[PDB]
Amino acid sequence: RSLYDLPPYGDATLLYFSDLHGQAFPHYFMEPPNLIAPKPLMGRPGYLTGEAILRYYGVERGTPLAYLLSYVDFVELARTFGPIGGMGALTALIRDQKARVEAEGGKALVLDGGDTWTNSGLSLLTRGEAVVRWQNLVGVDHMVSHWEWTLGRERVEELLGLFRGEFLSYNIVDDLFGDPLFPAYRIHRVGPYALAVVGASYPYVKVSHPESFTEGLSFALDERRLQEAVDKARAEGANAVVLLSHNGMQLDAALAERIRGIDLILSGHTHDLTPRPWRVGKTWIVAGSAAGKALMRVDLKLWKGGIANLRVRVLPVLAEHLPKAEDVEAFLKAQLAPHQDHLFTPLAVSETLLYKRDTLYSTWDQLVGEAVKAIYPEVEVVFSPAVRWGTTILPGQAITWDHLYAYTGFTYPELYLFYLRGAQIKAVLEDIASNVFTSDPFYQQGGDVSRVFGLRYVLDPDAPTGERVREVEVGGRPLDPNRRYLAAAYGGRLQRVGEAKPGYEPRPIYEVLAEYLRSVGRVRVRPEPNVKVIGRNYRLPEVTG
Ligand SMILES: [Mn+2]
Ligand SMILES: [Mn+2]
Numbered sequence: 024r025s026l027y028d029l030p031p032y033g034d035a036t037l038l039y040f041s042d043l044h045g046q047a048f049p050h051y052f053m054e055p056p057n058l059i060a061p062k063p064l065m066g067r068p069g070y071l072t073g074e075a076i077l078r079y080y081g082v083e084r085g086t087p088l089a090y091l092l093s094y095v096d097f098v099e100l101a102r103t104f105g106p107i108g109g110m111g112a113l114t115a116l117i118r119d120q121k122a123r124v125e126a127e128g129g130k131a132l133v134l135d136g137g138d139t140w141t142n143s144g145l146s147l148l149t150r151g152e153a154v155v156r157w158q159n160l161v162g163v164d165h166m167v168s169h170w171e172w173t174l175g176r177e178r179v180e181e182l183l184g185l186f187r188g189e190f191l192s193y194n195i196v197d198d199l200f201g202d203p204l205f206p207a208y209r210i211h212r213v214g215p216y217a218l219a220v221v222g223a224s225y226p227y228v229k230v231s232h233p234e235s236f237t238e239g240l241s242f243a244l245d246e247r248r249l250q251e252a253v254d255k256a257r258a259e260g261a262n263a264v265v266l267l268s269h270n271g272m273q274l275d276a277a278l279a280e281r282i283r284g285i286d287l288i289l290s291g292h293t294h295d296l297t298p299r300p301w302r303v304g305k306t307w308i309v310a311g312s313a314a315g316k317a318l319m320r321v322d323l324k325l326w327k328g329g330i331a332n333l334r335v336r337v338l339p340v341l342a343e344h345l346p347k348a349e350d351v352e353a354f355l356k357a358q359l360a361p362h363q364d365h366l367f368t369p370l371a372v373s374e375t376l377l378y379k380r381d382t383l384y385s386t387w388d389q390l391v392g393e394a395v396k397a398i399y400p401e402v403e404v405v406f407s408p409a410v411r412w413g414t415t416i417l418p419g420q421a422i423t424w425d426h427l428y429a430y431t432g433f434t435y436p437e438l439y440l441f442y443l444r445g446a447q448i449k450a451v452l453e454d455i456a457s458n459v460f461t462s463d464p465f466y467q468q469g470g471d472v473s474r475v476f477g478l479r480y481v482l483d484p485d486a487p488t489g490e491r492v493r494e495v496e497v498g499g500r501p502l503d504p505n506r507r508y509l510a511a512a513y514g515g516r517l518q519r520v521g522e523a524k525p526g527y528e529p530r531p532i533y534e535v536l537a538e539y540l541r542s543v544g545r546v547r548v549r550p551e552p553n554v555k556v557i558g559r560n561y562r563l564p565e566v567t568g
Contacts, residue, residue, distance in 0.1 A: 026087060026344075027119060031127040032322035032334045035213040037265065038117050039319045041136020041291035041311025044170070044412040045143025045154050046429065047355055049109035049342035051101050051415040052314040054296070055380035056094045056562045060469065061462040061484050068301045068310070069272045069293055069469060073562055080298040087339045091316055092296055098376060098568035101417055105343035108315025110355065112340050114161045114348035116318050120338070121162075130213045133188075135166035136291025136311040137224065137269040140182065141173055142412050144366050144428040145359060150174060153358050155182050160351055163188040165209065167269045168195075169225035169292060170412075173434040175236050191222025191267065193252045198241040207252040210261050216325040219256035221285075223249070223268040225292060233435055244270065246281060253284040263323070263330050265289065272301075272310055273467035279306035286330040287321070293469065294380070294411040300335050309335055313411065316340055369421030371540035374547035376566035377422075379413030379430065382459070383472050383482070384552040386566065387413065387430060391532070392476020393548065394539035395511050399440060401524075403497060404448065404478050408433075408514030409471035418567055422540055427533045431513070437529040438513040441521030446504040449495050451517065452480065456491040460484040473515070475553070478502075483557035494555075 060070040071079050073095055082088050090100035091107065117133055124131040135158065140151035151174050158166070165188055171179055183190055193207035208221040226244035228237055253264055265287045268275050272290040279285060280303060287300075288308045295310030296317065302308075307330065309319055322334040359366060379387045392405035414429040416422055443451075455472050462485065481494040495502035512518055513532040540546070550563045 026339060027116070029123070029320070029336060031129065033129070033324040033332070034216060035130045035132070035218055035323045035325065036120070036124045037132050037134055037289065037321040037323070038120050039134045039136065039289050039309070039311060039321060040113065040315065040317070041269075041289070042138040042294050042313035042412065043315050044138055044313065044429070045141055045146035045151075046108050046314045046414070047110050047143060047145040048425065049106035049112060050314070050429070051106055051417060052108070052316050053094050053097045053378045053380065053415045053564065054092060055382065056564050057382045058469070059382040059460070059484055059556065059559055061460045063462050063464055064469070068297055068308070069295050082298060087341065088298060088337060091312075091337065091339050092298065094564040097564055098417060098566070102568070104339075104341055107342070108340050109342045110157050110315065111348045111351045112342040112345045113315045113318065114157075114351045115345045116338060116340055117161055118348065119346075120318065120320055130211070132164045132211060132220065133162055134220065134267050134289060135163045135188070136267060136289060137167045138170045138291065138412070139166060141170040141434070142429065142432040144362075144425040144432070145355075147428055147432050148362055149358065150178060151182055152185070155185050157351065157354065159185070159187045160354060165189055165191050165220055165222065165267055167192055167222040167224050167267050167291070169228065169269045172228050172236050173232050176238065176240065191220065192224040193221060193249055194226060194242055194245055195224055196241050198239055201241070204240070208256050210256060210259060213325060216262045216327070217260045218323075218325065219261035219264045221252055221256065221264060221266045223266060223270050225269045225271075244274070246278070249278070250282055250284075253282060257284060262327050263287075263325050268292075271468055271470070272308065273469050275308055276301070276303045277465070277467050279303040279308065287323075287333070289319070289321070296337060297335070298337050300333065307333060312337070314414065366425045367423050369423060370427070370537055371543060372419065372421050372545045373416045374545060375418050375549055376564060377416035377548065378564065379415070380411060381471070383554045383556070383561075384474055384550075386548045386550050387416070388474035389476055389551070390546060390548045391536065392474070394536050395438065396477070397539055398535055399511065401509050402440065402477070402511045403508045404510045405476040406451075406510060406512040406515070406517055407474040407476065409473050410514065411471070424537065427536055431533045431536065433514050436513060436531040436533060438511060438532045438535055439518035439521075439529050440509065440511050440524035440527045441518050442507040442524065443510045443521050444504065445502045445506045445508060447520060448478070448497070448508060448510070449492060449502060449504070452492045452495070453489060456482065456484070457488040460491065479553040481555040481557065485558055
């Protein structure tokens with residue numbers, strides 16, 4: 024009846040998005056069919072999918088919110104409402120909203136949760152610069168970071184010189200002296216009140232990406248320093264404190280029970296959606312979604328001691344249903360005009376739905392495994408990175424280079440071929456499983472399993488560490504712990520424990536994909552999950568339509 028036409032509410036409005044991952048154009052982004060959790064974490068925000076998520080939030084099936092929120096009815100709703108995101112539509116929506124708030128005499132802040140500058144055609148072609156420029160066009164007040172660092176320390180410093188907003192992070196410090204490199208927070212006047220925005224960058228940057236990108240930096244989660252920063256903002260006059268975070272929602276939730284003084288957390292990193300805020304301790308938590316699919320409008324009623332009340336609305340960024348942001352459209356045309364040929368020409372047509380997100384398995388990741396095995400038939404197992412970023416290809420839709428970059432646009436995209444003993448394969452899976460499924464609530468945090476094309480296994484998320492992965496089979500034959508298997512991997516560090524295939528030169532995964540796609544012309548990868556999940560129903564979306 025009116026997704027965007029909202030009446031005024033409160034003293035301040037936060038317009039928040041996160042994990043855009045350089046997605047410049049309207050595209051499709053389906054939520055995961057599964058977000059598997061150990062028994063203790065089931066049924067909570069960050070672990071809800073399908074029908075369950077709709078019910079939890081009281082979202083009616085078939086609505087624009089349902090289209091964004093769940094994989095249920097995906098293909099059908101994508102045809103109905105159209106693509107989401109695009110920097111043009113996102114900008115138009117942010118401006119529409121900011122203009123409404125200011126006309127009400129309210130104070131509006133545009134907040135970016137990070138994982139913004141990277142992983143897209145536009146980003147790769149400009150080493151992130153064009154994304155920074157767009158941020159400057161819309162007018163981002165603050166941002167935090169994670170994948171930004173894959174551009175390397177030097178390049179990030181350069182880009183921050185261009186970024187007109189104020190970058191925040193309490194946790195990024197020099198690894199020798201420990202001095203913070205950036206402001207921990209910023210206090211903004213909101214009428215008679217003061218509202219502090221504290222920033223937190225992803226604390227595991229060092230172990231998640233090439234160490235050389237962050238040489239000289241520490242990103243470690245420091246609760247003592249976090250508390251001190253919150254205590255300081257207040258002593259300096261802050262009535263309410265908001266944490267603009269890239270810790271990940273489950274980690275944010277743990278902190279809400281350990282840190283005092285945080286009134287609201289805008290949770291990035293986990294690519295979650297929270298149509299209603301998640302109350303944890305004395306803190307409200309609102310997720311940043313991803314890929315430009317939504318703008319979270321958080322209206323705040325402040326009081327001398329914090330946040331009195333709040334209104335949260337997930338605003339769908341529907342390109343077909345929003346006005347154009349002319350300057351943005353113009354900037355994009357100017358930036359990618361010289362490369363539209365490369366970026367948008369079809370490489371192949373996908374007959375069925377290609378999706379990326381899921382705890383265990385995806386049709387997109389299988390496609391990649393099939394491409395690798397096709398070009399390198401000696402490869403027995405292909406380990407694909409379970410990143411949260413990517414895009415969704417509809418049936419009959421043509422795959423382009425822009426999609427390849429959205430899916431495999433790492434700054435370190437090299438595909439490695441190397442041998443692993445059978446015992447290593449099993450241990451790699453068991454190791455990931457122990458991270459992603461730890462029961463202990465004190466230790467959060469969730470976060471998907473590498474997809475291994477060429478093998479099948481049984482997973483029990485509730486079993487003890489060392490017993491979660493069993494009945495591993497490679498090509499129909501039981502895994503032989505002492506056998507050397509030829510593996511392929513990209514977007515990670517698995518190659519570090521393997522023996523490199525002689526004669527093989529690592530090259531960008533996307534070059535392998537383009538070669539394969541151009542040759543085959545059409546692909547049809549139906550969902551055939553390779554994992555038997557103990558104690559859970561494993562779900563699949565409808566891949567035709
Ligand atoms: Mn992300
Ligand atoms: Mn992230």
